[PDB]
Amino acid sequence: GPHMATGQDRVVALVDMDCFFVQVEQRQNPHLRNKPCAVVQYKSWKGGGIIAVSYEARAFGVTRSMWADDAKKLCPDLLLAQVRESRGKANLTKYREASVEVMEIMSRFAVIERASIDEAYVDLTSAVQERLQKLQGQPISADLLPSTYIEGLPQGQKEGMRKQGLFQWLDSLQIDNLTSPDLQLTVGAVIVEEMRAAIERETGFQCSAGISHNKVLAKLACGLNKPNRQTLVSHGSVPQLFSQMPIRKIRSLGGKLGASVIEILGIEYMGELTQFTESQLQSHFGEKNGSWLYAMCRGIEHDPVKPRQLPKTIGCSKNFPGKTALATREQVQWWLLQLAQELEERLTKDRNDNDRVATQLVVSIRVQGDKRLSSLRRCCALTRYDAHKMSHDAFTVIKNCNTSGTEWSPPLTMLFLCATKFSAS
DNA sequence: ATTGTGACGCT
Ligand SMILES: Nc1nc2c(ncn2[C@H]2C[C@H](O)[C@@H](COP(=O)(O)NP(=O)(O)OP(=O)(O)O)O2)c(=O)[nH]1
Ligand SMILES: [Mn+2]
Ligand SMILES: [Mn+2]
């Protein structure tokens, strides 16, 4: 009853850019705007692998992880932009820099947690309190929410339905109670409209967002009405929303754990989890996961928005599939040097921009015929931003994997160099 | 022959 805390203390948003790499390329090349297009990596093998797809191209069935040649079968007029290649590998610098543009705008409104190259969580609780006190009890006009959907409304064309649901929501609002969670979410949504307007004005990029009381619901909400819209998921919307929500749609349950929840419990949807005790869930999935699942199926999650705008690691990876797998010593050395040169460039720029230095270098490899994505992972000291030294140390750290009696065997199908353990400088 | 990352948990 009164003592069952409902996890309505916070206002959290998740902002995620729409078809991000495509928008970056469309901004640079106006011929690509408002067209079916996609961004690929490489080009020789089946036209390259697609990593981002405009919404126009998605209507033809083009998806991420498709080969461009196959996508062209679905979409013969598909336009393609290629990721930059430097030193024989994909170079994602243009998109990392675009990301920083967006992150810097978001950071003006509130402390953010970078969650990927194109998305961040925002803790808006303090900003909402400030705005509520500034409103001095003034109601909230629908004009302030021009791109907001209220999940689960209306009850009882697309734009018309959106505005009907928004009117139902706004007429139901108790504007006098500065502590109403629903009001707090609404004011959050007003701020997020302003944030998304600023992002689009100042970068040209459109994005969607979710507003709810925690990160998992905010991330789920964001995807409900993409592209170029934001979605408010209130605490009261959760039972209906979860009643037909496949468990795999929830962040962290899209893999083996979610499959085991489904198989062991004999359920399909998030809402069915409510019928199990906390102890039952802890028994099957462990104490942490069990407590998390017990609260999350009731809409409650406590994971904080971490104050972290910069990546915690800076890494460089390249696959060598099939007959391109590295089978000589000179090959492994040359590719370790290419990787180290890109790493050195990114680290030197990171030091100048962010006043920090990495102190540990992680070397990861895959060997041909190995089932695992990473065969060996070994760390050494990173004492100097020098590509030649980083590559020699990575080699020193992996060389005892070679079983040849000049050659390399088994051949290497992946190299990975990652700088970690940053320290102020 | 999805590839290139990046966060985080387990032991
Ligand atoms: N290298 C690489 N980059 C990737 C991969 N997957 C995604 N990216 C890059 C390209 C993506 O643009 C970007 C952001 O990933 P999302 O937010 O998951 N997708 P988006 O913003 O495209 O569309 P939506 O409107 O549905 O959010 O990350 C990958 O497997 N490899
Ligand atoms: Mn995105
Ligand atoms: Mn994203």
Side-chain angles (χ1 to χ4, degrees), chain A residues 1-129 131-135 137-156 159-162 164-425:
Chain A
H3 308 294
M4 264 186 185
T6 64
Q8 273 165 293
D9 255 21
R10 299 179 295 158
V11 182
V12 174
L14 182 277
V15 181
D16 182 291
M17 322 287 309
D18 302 332
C19 56
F20 183 44
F21 287 19
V22 167
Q23 286 200 89
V24 175
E25 299 294 337
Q26 289 175 326
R27 181 176 73 182
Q28 180 184 317
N29 182 353
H31 282 321
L32 303 173
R33 298 173 181 184
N34 304 304
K35 289 262 173 173
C37 55
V39 169
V40 300
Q41 295 187 127
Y42 303 118
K43 209 75 183 74
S44 273
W45 186 271
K46 324 191 164 178
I50 288 168
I51 56 171
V53 188
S54 81
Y55 281 78
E56 292 88 338
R58 293 182 197 194
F60 290 86
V62 185
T63 75
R64 146 192 200 281
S65 91
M66 224 177 237
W67 297 116
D69 289 346
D70 298 332
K72 280 285 200 178
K73 304 176 187 163
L74 299 181
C75 192
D77 295 327
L78 178 68
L79 305 180
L80 302 174
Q82 279 176 82
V83 168
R84 182 181 296 130
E85 164 266 310
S86 300
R87 326 169 173 91
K89 68 178 298 297
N91 183 359
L92 304 170
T93 300
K94 184 197 305 183
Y95 317 104
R96 291 197 185 94
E97 289 170 338
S99 176
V100 169
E101 283 186 63
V102 167
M103 297 310 178
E104 280 180 352
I105 298 158
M106 290 180 69
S107 293
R108 299 205 304 258
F109 296 81
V111 155
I112 77 170
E113 175 187 342
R114 186 201 199 261
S116 78
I117 196 160
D118 88 320
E119 76 214 71
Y121 296 92
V122 201
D123 199 319
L124 290 165
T125 315
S126 287
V128 162
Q129 285 345 291
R131 195 77 166 259
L132 267 168
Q133 255 288 69
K134 194 168 79 90
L135 284 152
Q138 144 201 276
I140 280 174
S141 152
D143 277 3
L144 297 186
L145 295 162
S147 60
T148 299
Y149 282 81
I150 311 284
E151 172 64 23
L153 294 187
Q155 37 96 354
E159 180 58 13
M161 293 279 300
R162 181 196 75 84
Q164 276 186 250
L166 182 63
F167 299 145
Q168 290 194 354
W169 176 258
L170 289 171
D171 302 316
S172 276
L173 253 192
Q174 52 173 316
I175 181 57
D176 53 318
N177 186 8
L178 291 150
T179 61
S180 165
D182 288 348
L183 184 60
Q184 292 172 347
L185 290 186
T186 304
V187 172
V190 170
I191 290 173
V192 173
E193 291 275 12
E194 290 161 3
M195 184 187 305
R196 297 178 46 244
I199 291 175
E200 186 175 9
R201 190 186 77 78
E202 296 174 35
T203 70
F205 302 145
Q206 291 180 344
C207 59
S208 302
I211 308 101
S212 194
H213 293 296
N214 55 67
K215 287 154 77 157
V216 164
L217 286 186
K219 173 66 176 172
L220 182 68
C222 180
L224 294 180
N225 286 292
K226 258 180 179 285
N228 198 31
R229 299 288 180 265
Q230 54 183 66
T231 303
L232 188 154
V233 162
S234 75
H235 184 76
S237 83
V238 171
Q240 293 229 67
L241 178 70
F242 278 10
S243 78
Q244 305 196 73
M245 203 39 86
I247 279 161
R248 71 183 168 259
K249 296 326 199 183
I250 299 298
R251 186 233 83 101
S252 81
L253 298 181
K256 309 197 160 186
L257 171 64
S260 72
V261 171
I262 288 157
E263 182 176 26
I264 296 172
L265 304 179
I267 64 177
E268 292 170 284
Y269 308 114
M270 212 40 215
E272 302 182 59
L273 275 168
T274 66
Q275 294 315 108
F276 300 95
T277 74
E278 193 171 359
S279 300
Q280 290 182 303
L281 298 173
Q282 287 178 322
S283 72
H284 293 298
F285 311 114
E287 151 158 50
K288 225 191 264 220
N289 286 331
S291 288
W292 185 87
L293 277 166
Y294 185 76
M296 191 72 261
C297 69
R298 300 165 164 77
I300 303 179
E301 204 236 356
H302 287 303
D303 191 23
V305 176
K306 297 179 178 183
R308 186 185 65 50
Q309 185 174 348
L310 310 173
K312 316 206 316 313
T313 57
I314 294 179
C316 304
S317 178
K318 186 164 167 44
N319 285 356
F320 302 95
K323 283 199 56 182
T324 67
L326 315 192
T328 60
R329 182 213 57 210
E330 308 97 277
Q331 260 189 316
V332 179
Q333 297 194 341
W334 192 82
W335 281 109
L336 283 167
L337 181 53
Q338 302 324 296
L339 276 192
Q341 284 175 357
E342 179 192 324
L343 187 55
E344 172 196 338
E345 196 161 308
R346 282 167 64 186
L347 283 167
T348 292
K349 164 48 92 83
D350 185 79
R351 193 169 55 210
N352 290 323
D353 279 344
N354 302 312
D355 295 314
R356 58 177 189 161
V357 179
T359 57
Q360 182 174 74
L361 174 71
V362 183
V363 195
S364 181
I365 87 181
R366 199 177 185 212
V367 317
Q368 192 141 252
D370 191 321
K371 59 171 175 66
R372 334 183 279 296
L373 281 317
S374 165
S375 297
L376 165 159
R377 200 281 209 161
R378 299 258 195 281
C379 84
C380 67
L382 206 181
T383 45
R384 284 209 182 91
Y385 285 6
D386 167 24
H388 288 282
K389 175 172 179 59
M390 260 160 309
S391 51
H392 175 95
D393 295 337
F395 185 53
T396 300
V397 159
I398 74 159
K399 54 182 199 23
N400 49 311
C401 283
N402 193 14
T403 52
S404 170
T406 318
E407 299 313 312
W408 202 288
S409 58
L412 297 191
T413 47
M414 186 267 293
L415 297 179
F416 173 82
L417 284 182
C418 184
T420 75
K421 287 184 183 345
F422 282 80
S423 186
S425 165

